[PDB]
Write a protein that binds this ligand. Structure first.
Ligand SMILES: *C/C=C(C)/C=C/C=C(C)/C=C/C1=C(C)CCCC1(C)C
Ligand SMILES: CCCCCCCC/C=C\CCCCCCCC(=O)O
Ligand SMILES: CCCCCCCC/C=C\CCCCCCCC(=O)O
Ligand SMILES: CCCCCCCC/C=C\CCCCCCCC(=O)O
Ligand SMILES: CCCCCCCCCCCCCCCCCCCC
Ligand SMILES: CCCCCCCCCCCCCCCCCCCC
Length: 218
């Protein structure tokens, strides 16, 4: 498991860079008024690229620092909400949702960090999990409520964005509890890495697809 985990870190590192530069290269494919979300998606992948280089070296050393993962999450998760909420809101409604979801994400990630750095299976470990879970469900329920009146191609493209988050973010709580299901400390890191690739690169691709639709492309 240890060698597999290192290799996945190294592959994911190049994957995040590839997501970054692909998304930048693809920005010319959409109208200029819809390129902001593609650029923000590239920034998300670029921040992850930076932290993934650190995580792979950290894992390779044998003294791994999950703080690298959690600081990447605390920066990138609110950024991912910036473009999701732009589809459905502007002005005051947008500013309120971006702030409130970003606060919730920070609580979720901070609670997860508190629990993950505690003894596995301890009351502190479960406290972090439960607080993070409740905040996560609150975020998902808010996300499900967004864009209810949308129709047509834009509604389909937004539902694809929503479903990627609603399904793909489930991997994180699974990874967090992997160490208590078995001798699976490394499996937590495997699942987190797979999830980050799927969720970061995947959301960027779907945001690009959202921009094509908004550009009037078929
Ligand atoms: C780019 C990175 C992303 C989108 C990371 C998202 C991570 C979360 C949704 C993790 C949430 C957690 C729980 C729901 C419970 C256990 C603790 C966490 C922080 C792993
Ligand atoms: C804790 C410090 C985090 C360090 C983050 C470093 C990330 C830099 C990676 C590449 C970013 C490039 C993404 C492009 C930015 C938007 C494109 C644009 O503005 O035209
Ligand atoms: C128990 C609920 C906790 C609520 C958290 C409130 C704000 C916490 C913000 C997020 C911190 C996550 C990043 C910390 C990792 C870096 C630590 C390190 O590098 O050593
Ligand atoms: C383990 C890995 C499981 C990954 C699950 C990913 C779920 C993707 C949800 C929806 C994606 C929608 C794509 C729109 C394409 C049209
Ligand atoms: C370290 C503490 C981080 C707290 C959250 C920081 C969020 C930064 C990204 C904000 C994007 C726009 C809302
Ligand atoms: C392991 C493979 C998981 C693939 C998930 C893809 C989600 C984003 C699709 C974008 C098109």
């Amino acid at each position: 498991m240890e060698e597999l985990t290192y290799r996945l870190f190294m592959v994911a590192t190049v994957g995040m860079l590839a997501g970054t530069v692909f998304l930048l290269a693809s920005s010319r494919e959409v109208k200029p008024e819809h390129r902001r979300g593609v650029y923000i998606s590239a920034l998300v992948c670029g921040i992850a690229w930076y932290h993934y280089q650190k995580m792979g070296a950290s894992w390779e050393s044998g003294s791994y620092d999950t703080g690298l993962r959690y600081v990447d999450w605390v920066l990138t998760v609110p950024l991912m909400f910036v473009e999701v909420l732009a589809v459905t809101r502007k002005g005051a409604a947008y500013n309120e949702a971006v702030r409130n979801w970003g606060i919730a994400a920070t609580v979720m990630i901070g609670a997860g960090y508190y629990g993950e750095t505690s003894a596995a299976g301890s009351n502190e470990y479960w406290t972090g999990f439960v607080i993070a879970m409740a905040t996560y469900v609150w975020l998902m329920r808010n996300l499900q409520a967004e864009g209810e009146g949308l129709k047509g191609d834009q509604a389909v493209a937004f539902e694809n964005i929503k479903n990627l988050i609603l399904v793909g973010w489930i991997i994180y709580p699974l990874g967090y509890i992997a160490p208590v299901v078995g001798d699976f400390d490394a499996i937590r890191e495997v699942l987190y890495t797979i999830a980050d690739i799927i969720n970061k690169v995947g959301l960027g691709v779907l945001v690009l697809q959202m921009a094509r639709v908004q550009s009037g492309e078929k």
